[PDB]
Amino acid sequence: MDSDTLSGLLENVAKKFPDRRALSVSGKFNLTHARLHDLIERAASRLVSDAGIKPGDVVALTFPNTVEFVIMFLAVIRARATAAPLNAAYTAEEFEFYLSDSDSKLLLTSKEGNAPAQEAASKLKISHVTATLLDAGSDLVLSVADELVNHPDDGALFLHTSGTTSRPKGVPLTQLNLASSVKNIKAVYKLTESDSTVIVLPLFHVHGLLAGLLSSLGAGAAVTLPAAGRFSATTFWPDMKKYNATWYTAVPTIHQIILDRHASHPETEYPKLRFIRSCSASLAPVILSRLEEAFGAPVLEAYAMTEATHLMSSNPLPEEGPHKPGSVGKPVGQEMAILNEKGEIQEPNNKGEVCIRGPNVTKGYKNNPEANKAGFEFGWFHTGDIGYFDTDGYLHLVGRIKELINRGGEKISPIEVDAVLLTHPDVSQGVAFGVPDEKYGEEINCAVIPREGTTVTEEDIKAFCKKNLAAFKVPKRVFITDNLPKTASGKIQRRIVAQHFLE
Measured distance CA(209)–CA(86) in Å, rounded:
12
Angle at which helices 6-16 and 33-50 cross, to 10°: 140
Measured distance CA(221)–CA(306) in Å, rounded:
23
The burial of 18, by beta-carbon neighbours within 10 Å (0-12 exposed, 13-18 middle, 19 or more buried), is given as middle
H helix runs in 273-377, sequence order: 285-295, 369-375
Measured distance CA(142)–CA(30) in Å, rounded:
21
Looking from the CA of 156 toward its CB, the CA atoms found within 13 Å total 30
| Contact (CB, 8 A) for 2 and 9 | yes
Task: Give the DSSP H or E segment for 407.
Answer: strand 405-407
H helix runs in 361-437, sequence order: 369-375, 414-422
Measured distance CA(229)–CA(215) in Å, rounded:
19
Residues of the binding site for CoA = 230, 409
- DSSP per residue, 201-223: S-TTSHIIIIIIIIHHHHTT-EE
The burial of 4, by beta-carbon neighbours within 10 Å (0-12 exposed, 13-18 middle, 19 or more buried), is given as middle
Residues of the binding site for oxalate = 280, 305, 310, 491
The burial of 341, by beta-carbon neighbours within 10 Å (0-12 exposed, 13-18 middle, 19 or more buried), is given as exposed
Residues in Cβ contact with 112 at an 8 Å cutoff, skipping those fewer than 6 apart: none
Please name the amino acid found at residue 366.
K
Which of 366, 368, 360 minimizes the C-alpha distance to 170? 366
Residues in Cβ contact with 481 at an 8 Å cutoff, skipping those fewer than 6 apart: 447, 448, 449, 501
**DSSP reduced 3-state for 383:** strand
The burial of 55, by beta-carbon neighbours within 10 Å (0-12 exposed, 13-18 middle, 19 or more buried), is given as middle
Please name the amino acid found at residue 367.
N
Angle at which helices 67-78 and 33-50 cross, to 10°: 60
H helix runs in 79-114, sequence order: 92-101
Residues in Cβ contact with 280 at an 8 Å cutoff, skipping those fewer than 6 apart: 207, 251, 252, 304, 489, 490, 491
Strand partners, 21: 32
Looking from the CA of 341 toward its CB, the CA atoms found within 13 Å total 1
**DSSP reduced 3-state for 436:** strand
Measured distance CA(292)–CA(315) in Å, rounded:
15
Cα dihedral across residues 289, 294, 298, 299: positive or negative: negative
From start to end of 111-152, where are the E strands?
127-132, 141-142
Method: X-ray
Residues of the binding site = 161-165, 205, 230, 280-282, 301-302, 305-306, 310, 385, 400, 409, 491
Say if strands 427-437 and 441-450 run parallel, antiparallel, or are unpaired.
antiparallel
CA dist list (Å): 344 to 336, 349, 394, 396, 492: 13, 14, 19, 18, 32
Measured distance CA(292)–CA(335) in Å, rounded:
30
**DSSP reduced 3-state for 447:** strand
Domain boundaries of the chain, sorted by first residue: 1-397, 398-503
Q: What is the resolution of this structure in A?
A: 2.0
From start to end of 133-178, where are the E strands?
141-142, 155-160, 170-174
- DSSP per residue, 288-315: HHHHHHHH-S-EEEEEEEGGGTEEEEEP
Which of 198, 189, 203, 209 minimizes the C-alpha distance to 309? 209
Which of 396, 373, 374, 394 minimizes the C-alpha distance to 384? 374
CB atoms closer than 10 angstroms to residue 25: 20
